[PDB]
Amino acid sequence: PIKLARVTKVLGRTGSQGQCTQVRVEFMDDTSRSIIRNVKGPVREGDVLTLLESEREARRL
Amino acid sequence: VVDPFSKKDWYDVKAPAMFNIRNIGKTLVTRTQGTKIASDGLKGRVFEVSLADLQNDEVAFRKFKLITEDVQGKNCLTNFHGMDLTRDKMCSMVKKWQTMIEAHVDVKTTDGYLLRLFCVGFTKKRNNQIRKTSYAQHQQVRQIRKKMMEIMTREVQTNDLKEVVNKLIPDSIGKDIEKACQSIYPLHDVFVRKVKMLKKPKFELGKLMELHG
Amino acid sequence: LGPQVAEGENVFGVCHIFASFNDTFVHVTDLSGKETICRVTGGMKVKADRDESSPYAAMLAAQDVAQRCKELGITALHIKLRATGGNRTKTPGPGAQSALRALARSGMKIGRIEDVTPIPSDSTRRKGGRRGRRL
Amino acid sequence: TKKRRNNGRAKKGRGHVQPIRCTNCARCVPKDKAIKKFVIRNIVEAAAVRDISEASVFDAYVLPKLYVKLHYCVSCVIHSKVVRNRSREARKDRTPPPRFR
RNA sequence: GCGCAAGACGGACCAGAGCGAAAGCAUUUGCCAAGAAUGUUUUCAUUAAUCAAGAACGAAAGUCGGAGGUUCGAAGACGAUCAGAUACCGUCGUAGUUCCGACCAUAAACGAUGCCGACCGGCGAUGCGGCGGCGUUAUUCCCAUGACCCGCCGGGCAGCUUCCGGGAAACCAAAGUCUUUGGGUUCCGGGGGGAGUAUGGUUGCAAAGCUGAAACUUAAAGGAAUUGACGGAAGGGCACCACC
RNA sequence: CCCCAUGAACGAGGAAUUCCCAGUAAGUGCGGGUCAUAAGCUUGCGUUGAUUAAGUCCCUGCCCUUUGUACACACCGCCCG
RNA sequence: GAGUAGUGUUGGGUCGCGAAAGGCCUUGUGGUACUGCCUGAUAGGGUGCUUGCGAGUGCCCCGGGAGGUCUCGUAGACCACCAUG
Ligand SMILES: [Mg+2]
Ligand SMILES: [Mg+2]
Ligand SMILES: [Mg+2]
Ligand SMILES: [Mg+2]
Ligand SMILES: [Mg+2]
Ligand SMILES: [Mg+2]
Ligand SMILES: [Mg+2]
Ligand SMILES: [Mg+2]
Ligand SMILES: [Mg+2]
Ligand SMILES: [Mg+2]
Ligand SMILES: [Mg+2]
Ligand SMILES: [Mg+2]
Ligand SMILES: [Mg+2]
Ligand SMILES: [Mg+2]
Ligand SMILES: [Mg+2]
Ligand SMILES: [Mg+2]
Ligand SMILES: [Mg+2]
Ligand SMILES: [Mg+2]
Ligand SMILES: [Mg+2]
Ligand SMILES: [Mg+2]
Ligand SMILES: [Mg+2]
Ligand SMILES: [Mg+2]
Ligand SMILES: [Mg+2]
Ligand SMILES: [Mg+2]
Ligand SMILES: [Mg+2]
Ligand SMILES: [Zn+2]
């Protein structure tokens, strides 16, 4: 299933070369579920991310 | 070349009448070529089964070894063999500031099965306890050991396998030790951690038939 | 091509996953364990000695045995995980973890998970020598 | 010059201690000096958690955990960075590091 | 997977915990003798402290015999790595590792700190015995008794702390009570090498152990701490002449 | 320098690597230097004018801090048979 | 009636838990909290769910009533080259 996500906070930048941003995800379905997630490119708080695999969790690079 | 797997045949392992759920599962045996009796090749097997699967209400970590003896034509007849704790739980209990206590007995049941029963316990931290450590002194320990020993001996020695297994399912015996020892020291987790088998009596169809139904 | 059972009920095999640091086995048997259904090993799927252990091997091996058992009517697998045990390592090798995750994906059912590494009460002397294995 | 007052090993008021073989090396070290570390984790790790959780035939089956006590001979630790060297004064503090937030 | 067999080893619990003169000493259970501490309005009445000579026990390896040989494993053999490796790494493997019976007497046998004794700050802990004290628990009331709890006493194993005082300093509540120098006592050191060698004596089955010089040679050798420099040691830190 | 002819390699460049964050990279001409005659070089000058990042120590490079040292002519050190 | 009957146990005790039949002799308390499950009391001992975690909040039984993606925060990040000067 395809899902949507909301940015609650920006925590740090994960990467070897300092590539990924490690961001915190609310679900736009009004659910309270909170998952950390890796995102590439620029991110500011409040943005919406589209997840193709929505059950996956964030690991440290 | 030739597929070994088409000469296979599926059989049904059904547990005895002690527990709730009957069919533990399926077992796979190569058909009789007449040089080798398949009923015999199948005759000697153990099964490692979680109690959770035999009877619906219970704890995951008690395992039963079950032996097939007779085959009923795609029914296998299973008698109790052994019992043990899942390694996970056994490790979960053991911790660093408490004394551990272990004992074991060899007992013949009334019908003649010979069992080895193992006994595990721990010193439990009292609820307001300020001191870091619950240790028990040597003589206290030995007291406990002796009582563990005494209890389960009398529990088995009086009863036949049927009632023994029946006591082992909920673990009556553990709770028994625990209550009985509160005077000497506050025992904590107390189990029969293992059950072994030493001698089965000469095999008898009738006895087993009664055990199944 | 196997057991005759309704669509609800799942046939259980017992899968032994052995991960040393050398290589993995994904080994699937009956309940008794006295009959093996299927056995695939790490060094089998991949050719190089280095790669013998590595998670990738686990992947392949697992996908394959799981397939082959999906053939024979075994849907659900009890899992007994194993580390090399005895005097040597009690950690399971890296392979096992991957392997496990893998034969989930193939659509297998997972029964109880249990950990059996042979663990000594007290062993024979370990294979290095007093001052250790230095490198 | 005496470096530690306790000489690195915890042995006090007894003469000799039963030696144990290292996890990593196999090098022999007395049980007192050995840098000990206890490990409780889950058999399956982070991601495969969520994965396997779906493939169960059981509802609310909680993953078993793996329990292992490690010993590390003084050398092997410092290589594995289980233990790192610290300053003359800050040496003296035997309070275990704050893994508790 | 199921059984069988053999010899080893007693995991986790196990700790700056115990016990032993030190070496050393962890499965259960019974038998055999010891032992500290505690308790005491018991008994003896100076019987004690330390000790040349002389003794008892003394890790590991080693040595004789016997038994036994799972694992590990000097020696050795290969396989690698390397310029070379008779070394680290790997596959093997003899003696040995194990038990019984005799020898051997040495270890960084270390607290690198003789033993008995007196006095000199605190502070919490811990082990053993004792003594007192609300209150919990072993179900509901009485006494025992055990478990926790709050103290006190005597021995212990230690710890933290401190302008007690020492100390060349590191550090030490002893390494304190030392030029304000004396409680008793035993071993023992006198620049570095030569050398724990030569010789004699003596012990052993031998490997060796104890005892132990000299010629010569040499301005330092050494101990703590301090700035440096360096590290194939650990952490941070920056820079589009580093990357993303 | 100029007119005619001659009209060849070259099909977006392997392992590696260089310079760069906003009137900036880059394209494009122009001035000054050298100069009797000369800019495929340099030094300046405008013009057209972006993609991407506002982060990280992975690599490379040096800095501190802790730490060990038998080095101090300071590791190209010292030193053993 | 009677803390008797019955029932219950580590050492004992002057015991712990605790009925009913049936009558007699005339009312035969109020106020005020809570309450997941297990064991053995609303005590004691284990053990939980609500959102990954930490807070809150709720979780004995019945009837009826409506109101619903409970609220607030939130790192929860873990998968051997190389002599000499
Ligand atoms: Mg040093
Ligand atoms: Mg010693
Ligand atoms: Mg002592
Ligand atoms: Mg043990
Ligand atoms: Mg003498
Ligand atoms: Mg010896
Ligand atoms: Mg020997
Ligand atoms: Mg011999
Ligand atoms: Mg060679
Ligand atoms: Mg070798
Ligand atoms: Mg070998
Ligand atoms: Mg002697
Ligand atoms: Mg000596
Ligand atoms: Mg000495
Ligand atoms: Mg003396
Ligand atoms: Mg006491
Ligand atoms: Mg008292
Ligand atoms: Mg004391
Ligand atoms: Mg003097
Ligand atoms: Mg001299
Ligand atoms: Mg001498
Ligand atoms: Mg001589
Ligand atoms: Mg020095
Ligand atoms: Mg770097
Ligand atoms: Mg110098
Ligand atoms: Zn090591």
Query: At what angle are helices C94-105 and D46-54 packed, to 10 degrees?
Result: 30
Indicate the residue type of C64.
D
- What is the per-residue DSSP string for D55-97? SBSSTTPPPPEEEEEEEE-HHHHHHHTSS----TTGGG--PPP
Nearest by CB to D64, which of C101, C115, C125? Answer: C115
| Tokens 């007291």 sit on residue | B143
| Residues of chain B contacting C, Cβ within 8 Å | 5, 10, 13, 24-29, 44-48, 50, 52, 60, 86-88
Residue pair A54/A33 in contact by the 8 Å Cβ criterion: no
Beta bridge partners of C6: none
D44 contact residues in C (CB cutoff 8 A) = 97, 100-101, 113
Q: What is the CATH number of domain C1-135?
A: 3.30.420.80
User: Distance between CA atoms of B4 and B12, rounded to whole angstroms?
Assistant: 20
Where along chain A do its domains lie? 1-61
What gap in Å lies between CA B179 and CA B172, rounded to an integer? 11
Q: How many domains does chain B have?
A: 1
H/E run at residue C43: helix C42-45
User: What does the domain layout of chain C look like in residue ranges?
Assistant: 1-135
Distance from CA of D40 to the nearest CA of B (A): 9
Q: Specify the resolution in Å.
A: 3.9
Rounded CA separation B177/B86 (Å): 21
Question: Tokens 């620029």 sit at which residue?
Answer: A42
Task: Give nucleotides in strand G with any atom < 7 A to a protein C-beta.
Answer: 10, 40, 44-46, 51-53, 69-80
What is the CA angle B88-B92-B95, rounded to 5? 145
* Number of domains making up chain D: 1
Tell me the CB-side half-sphere exposure of residue B12, using CA atoms within 13 A: 11
B61: CB partners within 8 A, 6+ apart: B50, B85, B86, B88, B89
Q: How far is the CA of A50 from the C1' of G67 (A)?
A: 33
Q: Give residue B100's Cα distance to chain centre.
A: 21
Residue B24 in domain:
yes
Q: Which pair of structure tokens corresponds to residue C95?
A: 């392979």
Q: In which element (H, E) is residue C110 found?
A: strand C109-115
Tokens of residue C66, six digits: 């799981």
Helix (H, G, I), strand (E, B) or coil at D15: coil
What is the DSSP secondary-structure string of chain B?
A: ---GGGSEEEEEEE--TTSS--EEEEEEEEPP-SSS-HHHHTTT-EEEEEHHHHSTTS-TTEEEEEEEEEE-SS-EEEEEEEEEE-HHHHHHH--SSB-EEEEEEEEE-SS--EEEEEEEEEB---TT--SS-B---HHHHHHHHHHHHHHHHHHHHTS-HHHHHHHHTTTHHHHHHHHHTTTTS-B-S-EEEEEEEEEPPSP-HHHHHHHH-
Q: Contact at 8 Å (CB) between C95 and C57?
A: yes
**Spatial separation of the C-alpha atoms in residues B19 and D1, rounded to whole Å:** 70
Length of chain A: 61
**Closest C-alpha to C103, from C131, C76, C134:** C76
Show the tokens assigned to B194: 């293992």
Helices (H), C49-123: 55-72, 94-105
Q: Taking the CA of residue B128 as centre, how many other CA atoms within 13 Å lie in the half-sphere pointing to its CB?
A: 0
Name the closest residue on chain D to residue B96, using Cα atoms. Answer: D38
Q: By what method was this entry solved?
A: cryo-EM
Distance (Å, rounded) from C-alpha B30 to C-alpha C97? 33
Q: Is position B1 within any domain?
A: no
- CATH number, domain at D42? 3.30.1740.20
CA dist list (Å): C106 to A10, B75, C68, C111: 36, 31, 11, 15
Residue by residue, DSSP assigns A4-59 as EEEEEEEEE---SSS--EEEEEEETTS---EEEEEE-S---TT-EEEESS-S----
